């Protein structure tokens, strides 16, 4: 029931993605590629941000605190099984990929299978379904 602060802003810019001024904080971070729900809840919990703030008052320090949490999730006691790339078939590292880096790794995987000339690679090249369907 707090009055609008006149500093309320729309399309909050974060991680090179426009994030709606409305919507609760967990469901606004869901619009950043790689985060998704059930991860934005952990991000807000570990950044000390209430999940009932609706991005109306997201001061630059709070955005920076959020952005540094997602940058290194394991530094804030996020379990390894709670992550995007668990063991990285190429590098051999555990990390979380977000914000236009997941797509780059996706095209890296597709070309890696093509050079291998595995069955999954050739089916991807022809545009067919790679699972059993």
């Amino acid at each position: 029931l707090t009055l609008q602060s006149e500093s309320f802003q729309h399309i909050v810019r974060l991680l090179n993605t426009n994030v709606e001024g409305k919507r609760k904080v967990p469901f606004a971070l869901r619009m950043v590629k790689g985060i998704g729900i059930r991860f934005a809840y952990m991000v807000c919990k570990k950044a000390g941000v209430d999940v009932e703030r609706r991005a109306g008052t997201l001061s630059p320090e709070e955005l920076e605190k959020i952005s540094e949490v997602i940058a290194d999730p394991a530094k804030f006691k996020i379990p390894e099984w709670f992550l995007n790339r668990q063991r990285d078939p190429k590098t051999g590292k555990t990390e979380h990929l977000t914000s236009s880096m997941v797509d780059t790794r996706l095209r890296e995987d597709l070309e890696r299978l093509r050079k291998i000339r595995a069955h999954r690679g050739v089916r991807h090249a022809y545009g067919l379904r790679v699972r059993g369907q």
Binding site: L128, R129, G132, Q133
Partner: peptide
Amino acid sequence: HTCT
């Protein structure tokens, strides 16, 4: 399987 595939249908389309």
